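Try it yourself: sequence plus 4P1, in.
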Amino acid sequence: TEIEHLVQSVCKSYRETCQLRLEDLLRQRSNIFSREEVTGYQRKSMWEMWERCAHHLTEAIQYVVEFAKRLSGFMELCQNDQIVLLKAGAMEVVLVRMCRAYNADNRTVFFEGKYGGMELFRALGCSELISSIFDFSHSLSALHFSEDEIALYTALVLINAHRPGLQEKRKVEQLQYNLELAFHHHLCKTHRQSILAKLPPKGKLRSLCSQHVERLQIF
Ligand SMILES: CNC(=O)c1ccc(Cl)c(-c2ccc3c(c2)CCCN3C(=O)c2c(F)cccc2Cl)c1
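Structure, out:
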């Protein structure tokens, strides 16, 4: 039950640090882009559309940093390892967090006040990647994660002791192990263990968050 106090702690850090309130996202599912707004976005140059998207992604990252800061043990890690973990994991967490912005019923995603499909992002240069991002959100949305589960899962996406560059490896390993124990305890308690087998495989998140995203300093 130190474990259950950890579960509650991680869930509160997550709830305090969302960019978007879940209930606002659900409210807005009826609010969908017209054929003309989609065309208005398809018409934008590659540059301006990346500028747009890289801005949103940088704000989304700041919310993940604030998640890390409010997370138990994280802030007692040495500064080098805080930076290593966030550099390695922050994009991944944003990707995982976007499934709450995704509506599996019509395959739309929340974007700049309204919901739209993947053809919204045509001006970007990368239909393969967009498709892959959508397919992944579609799969992650199928778990119907509780708020607890997604808080713990994203905690673990972040506190990963296999990140090249950590000095105090062991101290991150204990933090990871305690988060793992919290997660498996909570899943066992609610008979949700089965979802473990449906989580993304080792290296799936990495492969989404490398293709095309990095060196965005240019926007
Ligand atoms: C009012 N606020 C917003 O609308 C808002 C807030 C937060 C965010 Cl994160 C977004 C947003 C940002 C980027 C993207 C999407 C939504 C949906 C698809 C394109 N995309 C990506 O996921 C992105 C990625 F993660 C990997 C590779 C390529 C890309 Cl472009 C929009």
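One thing you can check immediately is this: The longest helix spans residues 46-70.
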